[PDB]
Amino acid sequence: TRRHKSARQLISDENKRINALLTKANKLVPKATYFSVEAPPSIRP
Amino acid sequence: KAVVIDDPPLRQTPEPFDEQSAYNPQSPIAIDFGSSKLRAGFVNHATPTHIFPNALTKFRDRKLNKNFTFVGNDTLLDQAVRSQSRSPFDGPFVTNWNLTEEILDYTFHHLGVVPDNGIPNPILLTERLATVQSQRTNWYQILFETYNVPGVTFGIDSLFSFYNYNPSGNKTGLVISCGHEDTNVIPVVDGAGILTDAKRINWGGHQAVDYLNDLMALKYPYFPTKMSYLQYETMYKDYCYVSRNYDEDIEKILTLENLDTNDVVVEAPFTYDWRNSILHLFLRGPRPHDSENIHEQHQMHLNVERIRVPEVIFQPTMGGQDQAGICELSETILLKKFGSQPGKLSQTSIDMVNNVLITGGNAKVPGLKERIVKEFTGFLPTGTNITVNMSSDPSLDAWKGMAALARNEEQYRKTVISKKEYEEYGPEYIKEHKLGNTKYFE
Amino acid sequence: IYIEANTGAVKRVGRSDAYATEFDLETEEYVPLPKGEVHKKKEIVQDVTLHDLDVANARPQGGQDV
């Protein structure tokens, strides 16, 4: 009976999982997540 | 010149259903779970057998138990059933699970596969880049404890297309895919996608049609009839091309001599000089406006800014996302990574430049390859040979990718995630094969 | 910019239009990118006279190069 999960909160609870993992590990550079794959903003105007 | 009209409605397919009962119980099944088009077929066939719009509906019919014409091309018989036909795919992820179970059940009916426990065939999935872990655990659930598939593997469809057009499996190249809801640039070294240096633009082709809808609604706030979204895709895939140079075109796009050949006027269905006024040229084209005619009220005067819609994959700031375009991402990949500096290129960068592949459903916009190669020779050093590869139809070549991975036996068996490996390792497991995703950490 | 390899002269043509939208208003002169190649080589002939070479190195106040 899994709920009708939207596409909004899945990014943020992945993000919560990544901060939980890095705070439990550093007390670890990520390789390829949904946020490191994101393109940086442009440097030319 | 007589002004012509363009009616945009799309016809209805009269033959939705075709399947064969004879099938091979050992041959695996290749399905591409695309955001726009579902693709389905066997392994031994070169072309995919079933092409579907990846949408389903729940038709409510009185006195026949309220459950009819559920999944597939059966929605294309009538406009009324195609109106509420809900494709369950959101932006990154499909949403509902019983809907996807109905898609899988319908397509498994359409290969004529007989029951043998759950499913007696291995499956061949396509997975998006940098997939959320919850999606892959629920994917593991909906294969293993739903359909009992003995063999699962999945990978990026752009990497599948690169493996299709380079069947050696150890080539070096750069793949630029533009899907329905996502575009990305992935560098491949030795057949292995360096996803660590792949990038992503959240535009695709769905947001291009949404951009055309928003533009043409803001241009005409008092349009009489409601313009349908399917017709927005129809007149997007017909009058939108990429300019060779965008900067020198927009200062020429509204001149009087350019409007004769550039401008095409669309017509919606139903039942103080104007030459010096560039607002009249923008709104009503190179013809004088007849405000009393019922055609001109319904005249959907596009093509004045048909260049603006496909250009935004090169300048994403016009789409609202603060991301560098695929030109800048390709520049950074080919000039700053893999031991390459601005000024001198490493051998991997030269081999990547010599093998550039563009694919996806949004790649069939005209003028893309010439713009890509001109922008590539803009920043690359002189004398560097640039080869940009294209397909006849770059939307379904990923299916040929998993077909080519299926023909290769030893490359199939590296990537196979079995039921036993899933049971001992749990649902948090990724085979770091080269033709697919990698671990989130080291 | 413009560079002559033999003479060594450097002339700044001006800023490119790729950086024309850093500010809405600035004193920079925005010129297009060159359509041709970066490096261009050709052959020329110099027709001088002996009086030109006489007055070239006979200056009471020098500084003909600047």
Side-chain angles (χ1 to χ4, degrees), chain B residues 27 40 62 86 90 121 238 242 247-248 290 333-334 337 348 352 365 371 379 392:
Chain B
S27 173
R62 308 286 107 94
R86 206 64 46 83
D90 222 318
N121 288 124
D238 290 358
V242 190
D247 248 5
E248 63 105 2
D290 190 15
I333 284 171
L334 296 168
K337 320 295 255 308
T348 75
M352 263 201 261
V365 176
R371 171 68 181 273
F379 61 89
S392 82

Short mmCIF file of all heavy atoms in Angstrom, two decimals, chain B residues 27 40 62 82 86 90 121 238 242 247-248 290 333-334 337 348 352 365 371 379 392, unseen atoms left out:
data_model
loop_
_atom_site.label_atom_id
_atom_site.label_comp_id
_atom_site.label_asym_id
_atom_site.label_seq_id
_atom_site.Cartn_x
_atom_site.Cartn_y
_atom_site.Cartn_z
N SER B 27 15.29 -17.08 -24.16
CA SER B 27 15.76 -15.80 -24.66
C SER B 27 15.31 -14.67 -23.73
O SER B 27 14.14 -14.64 -23.33
CB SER B 27 15.24 -15.55 -26.07
OG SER B 27 15.56 -14.24 -26.51
N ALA B 40 9.83 -2.28 -26.37
CA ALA B 40 9.79 -3.65 -25.90
C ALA B 40 10.16 -4.59 -27.04
O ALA B 40 9.87 -4.31 -28.21
CB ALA B 40 8.40 -4.02 -25.37
N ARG B 62 -19.89 2.11 -17.19
CA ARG B 62 -21.04 1.58 -16.47
C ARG B 62 -21.41 0.20 -17.00
O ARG B 62 -21.03 -0.18 -18.11
CB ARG B 62 -22.24 2.53 -16.61
CG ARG B 62 -21.93 3.97 -16.24
CD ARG B 62 -21.80 4.16 -14.74
NE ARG B 62 -20.41 4.36 -14.34
CZ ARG B 62 -19.84 5.54 -14.20
NH1 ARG B 62 -20.50 6.67 -14.42
NH2 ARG B 62 -18.56 5.60 -13.82
N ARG B 82 -7.85 9.16 -24.66
CA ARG B 82 -6.51 9.72 -24.68
C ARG B 82 -6.39 11.02 -23.91
O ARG B 82 -5.26 11.47 -23.66
CB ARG B 82 -6.05 9.94 -26.13
N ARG B 86 -3.05 8.89 -18.26
CA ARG B 86 -2.02 9.42 -17.38
C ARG B 86 -0.74 8.60 -17.57
O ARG B 86 -0.68 7.44 -17.16
CB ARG B 86 -2.48 9.37 -15.92
CG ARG B 86 -1.82 10.40 -15.03
CD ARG B 86 -2.20 11.81 -15.45
NE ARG B 86 -3.63 11.94 -15.70
CZ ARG B 86 -4.54 12.15 -14.76
NH1 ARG B 86 -4.21 12.26 -13.48
NH2 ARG B 86 -5.82 12.24 -15.11
N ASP B 90 6.86 11.09 -13.71
CA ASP B 90 7.15 12.46 -13.31
C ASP B 90 8.47 12.87 -13.94
O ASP B 90 8.92 12.27 -14.92
CB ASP B 90 7.14 12.59 -11.79
CG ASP B 90 6.44 13.84 -11.31
OD1 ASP B 90 6.65 14.91 -11.93
OD2 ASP B 90 5.69 13.77 -10.32
N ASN B 121 12.21 -15.60 -17.99
CA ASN B 121 13.17 -14.92 -18.84
C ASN B 121 13.94 -13.87 -18.05
O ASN B 121 13.38 -13.23 -17.15
CB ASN B 121 12.47 -14.24 -20.03
CG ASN B 121 11.97 -15.24 -21.05
OD1 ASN B 121 10.78 -15.26 -21.38
ND2 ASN B 121 12.87 -16.06 -21.56
N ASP B 238 7.83 20.15 -35.66
CA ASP B 238 7.68 20.39 -37.12
C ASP B 238 8.28 21.73 -37.54
O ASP B 238 8.73 21.82 -38.69
CB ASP B 238 6.22 20.37 -37.55
CG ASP B 238 5.56 19.01 -37.49
OD1 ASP B 238 6.26 18.03 -37.16
OD2 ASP B 238 4.35 18.93 -37.78
N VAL B 242 17.58 24.48 -34.93
CA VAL B 242 18.68 25.15 -34.25
C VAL B 242 19.44 25.99 -35.26
O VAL B 242 19.82 25.49 -36.33
CB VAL B 242 19.61 24.14 -33.57
CG1 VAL B 242 20.59 24.85 -32.66
CG2 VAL B 242 18.80 23.11 -32.79
N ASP B 247 23.41 34.45 -32.15
CA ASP B 247 23.58 35.87 -31.86
C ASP B 247 23.27 36.74 -33.07
O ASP B 247 22.64 37.79 -32.93
CB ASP B 247 24.99 36.13 -31.35
CG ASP B 247 25.03 36.53 -29.90
OD1 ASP B 247 23.96 36.51 -29.25
OD2 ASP B 247 26.12 36.86 -29.39
N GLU B 248 23.71 36.33 -34.25
CA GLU B 248 23.47 37.10 -35.46
C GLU B 248 22.13 36.78 -36.11
O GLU B 248 21.79 37.40 -37.12
CB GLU B 248 24.60 36.88 -36.47
CG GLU B 248 24.71 35.45 -36.97
CD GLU B 248 24.19 35.27 -38.38
OE1 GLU B 248 23.77 36.28 -38.99
OE2 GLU B 248 24.20 34.12 -38.88
N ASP B 290 -6.10 41.35 -40.30
CA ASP B 290 -7.54 41.47 -40.52
C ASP B 290 -8.22 41.05 -39.23
O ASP B 290 -8.46 39.86 -38.99
CB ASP B 290 -7.99 40.62 -41.71
CG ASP B 290 -9.42 40.90 -42.13
OD1 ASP B 290 -9.97 41.94 -41.70
OD2 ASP B 290 -9.99 40.09 -42.88
N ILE B 333 35.04 19.34 -20.26
CA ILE B 333 35.43 17.93 -20.35
C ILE B 333 36.63 17.76 -21.28
O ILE B 333 37.61 17.09 -20.94
CB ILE B 333 34.23 17.08 -20.79
CG1 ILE B 333 33.26 16.88 -19.62
CG2 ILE B 333 34.67 15.72 -21.33
CD1 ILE B 333 31.95 16.24 -20.02
N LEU B 334 36.59 18.39 -22.46
CA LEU B 334 37.64 18.19 -23.44
C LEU B 334 38.87 19.06 -23.22
O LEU B 334 39.89 18.83 -23.87
CB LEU B 334 37.09 18.44 -24.85
CG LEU B 334 36.00 17.46 -25.30
CD1 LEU B 334 35.32 17.97 -26.56
CD2 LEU B 334 36.58 16.08 -25.52
N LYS B 337 39.80 18.21 -18.14
CA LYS B 337 39.83 16.92 -17.46
C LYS B 337 40.68 15.94 -18.26
O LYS B 337 41.08 16.22 -19.40
CB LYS B 337 38.41 16.38 -17.28
CG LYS B 337 37.37 17.42 -16.89
CD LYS B 337 37.65 18.03 -15.53
CE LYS B 337 36.70 17.48 -14.48
NZ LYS B 337 35.28 17.61 -14.90
N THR B 348 43.51 10.92 -24.87
CA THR B 348 42.13 10.56 -24.58
C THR B 348 41.17 11.65 -25.04
O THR B 348 40.09 11.36 -25.56
CB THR B 348 41.95 10.30 -23.09
OG1 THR B 348 41.95 11.54 -22.38
CG2 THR B 348 43.09 9.43 -22.57
N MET B 352 38.37 11.31 -27.88
CA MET B 352 37.00 11.69 -27.55
C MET B 352 36.44 12.67 -28.56
O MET B 352 35.25 12.61 -28.91
CB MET B 352 36.97 12.29 -26.15
CG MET B 352 36.59 11.31 -25.09
SD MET B 352 35.98 12.15 -23.63
CE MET B 352 37.46 12.09 -22.63
N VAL B 365 15.72 17.26 -33.81
CA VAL B 365 15.56 18.66 -34.21
C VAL B 365 16.62 19.00 -35.26
O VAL B 365 17.81 18.71 -35.04
CB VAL B 365 15.67 19.58 -32.99
CG1 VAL B 365 15.61 21.04 -33.40
CG2 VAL B 365 14.57 19.25 -31.99
N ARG B 371 25.43 22.87 -35.68
CA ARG B 371 25.68 23.79 -34.57
C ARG B 371 26.68 23.20 -33.58
O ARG B 371 27.58 23.90 -33.10
CB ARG B 371 24.37 24.13 -33.88
CG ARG B 371 24.51 24.90 -32.57
CD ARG B 371 25.02 26.31 -32.81
NE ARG B 371 25.18 27.05 -31.57
CZ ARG B 371 24.22 27.75 -30.98
NH1 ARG B 371 23.01 27.84 -31.51
NH2 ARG B 371 24.48 28.39 -29.85
N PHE B 379 36.19 26.35 -30.06
CA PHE B 379 37.14 26.40 -28.95
C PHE B 379 38.28 25.39 -29.07
O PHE B 379 39.30 25.56 -28.38
CB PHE B 379 36.43 26.20 -27.60
CG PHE B 379 35.71 24.88 -27.43
CD1 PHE B 379 36.36 23.76 -26.93
CD2 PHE B 379 34.37 24.78 -27.73
CE1 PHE B 379 35.68 22.56 -26.77
CE2 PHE B 379 33.68 23.59 -27.58
CZ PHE B 379 34.34 22.48 -27.09
N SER B 392 19.90 7.49 -37.88
CA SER B 392 18.70 7.76 -38.67
C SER B 392 17.51 8.06 -37.77
O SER B 392 16.71 8.96 -38.06
CB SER B 392 18.40 6.57 -39.58
OG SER B 392 17.70 5.55 -38.88
#
